Amino acid sequence: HTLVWGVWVNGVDQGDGRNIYIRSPPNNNPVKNLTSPDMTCNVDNRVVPKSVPVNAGDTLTFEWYHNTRDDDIIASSHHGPIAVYIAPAASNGQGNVWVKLFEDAYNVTNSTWAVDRLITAHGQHSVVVPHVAPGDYLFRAEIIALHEADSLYSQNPIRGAQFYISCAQITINSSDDSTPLPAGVPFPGAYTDSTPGIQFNIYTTPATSYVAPPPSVWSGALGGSIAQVGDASLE
């Protein structure tokens, strides 16, 4: 159970984004129904009043929390991957529009899941703003908790992979458009009962064998990190 509090741009906190520039759902419960319209941007997808200004190449940092800012972030049970997708804002997230900018699943070097490192990073993970056409975008940050993913939700609705999905409104101002955004995947649609990485038993299957759900990271993506960029405690 986790939510986005806000974003940082180049290590500068943009402030509380909840229901302001984040299309915040009413609570931190996961989406689990892979065919749900809730897979797009969680249960309360609507235009919120503010879009955060960035330029291509900026570091954009998502900041997650559990109950209060800079707390335990997410229950340590919730091992799994983190991804970030981008879609033009006019799509409202509908259709074949979601392009993956970031994937981090299980790090063999470190022996840790992305979520383990997200807790260490005080809820912070970052992407480099890609060189797409200037305009309004949705940045869909997605944590999959796999602690109950041995079952399909479709076979047992009390279990299944848990999607923590947050859509941030980001306006890209300065961009040379060196990597124009292609068509992407639909949410719901991209993940099905047969997709690799949706059904996974962390109790019996080694994390070293985990394959995160496609699609692959787009060739236009410039990278990211799971690391604390800003100290909320200094504010």
Which residues belong to the annotated binding site for O2? 147, 162
Per CB under 5 A, which of residues 1..40 are in contact with Cu ion? 1
**DSSP H helical ranges for the chain:** 114-120
- Minimum Å gap between C-beta 78 and Cu ion is 6
107 Cβ partners below 8 Å, 6+ apart? Answer: 113, 114, 117
Please give the residue whose beta carbon sits closest to Cu ion in the complex.
Answer: 1
- Minimum Å gap between C-beta 80 and Cu ion is 11
- Minimum Å gap between C-beta 47 and Cu ion is 27
Q: Is 214 helix (H, G, I), strand (E, B) or coil?
A: coil
- Minimum Å gap between C-beta 173 and Cu ion is 36
Q: Residues forming the annotated binding site for (1,4-beta-D-glucosyl)n?
A: 9, 47-48, 58, 67, 129, 140
50 binds Cu ion (CB under 5 A): no
120 Cβ partners below 8 Å, 6+ apart? Answer: none
- Is the Cβ of residue 50 or residue 117 nearer to Cu ion in the bound state? 117
Q: Is the dihedral of CA 33, 181, 89, 83 positive or negative?
A: positive
Number of residues that bind Cu ion (CB under 5 A): 1
Q: Residues forming the annotated binding site?
A: 1, 9, 47-48, 58, 67, 78, 129, 140, 147, 162, 164
Q: 96: how many CB neighbours lie within 10 A of its CB?
A: 14
Closest CA to 24 of 48, 40, 50, 60: 48
Nearest-angstrom CA–CA distance, 21 and 47? 9
- Is the Cβ of residue 1 or residue 18 nearer to Cu ion in the bound state? 1
Q: Is 97 helix (H, G, I), strand (E, B) or coil?
A: coil
- Is the Cβ of residue 1 or residue 50 nearer to Cu ion in the bound state? 1
Q: What DSSP state is assigned to residue 28?
A: S
- Minimum Å gap between C-beta 227 and Cu ion is 23
Residue numbers of the site for Cu ion (CB under 5 A)?
Answer: 1
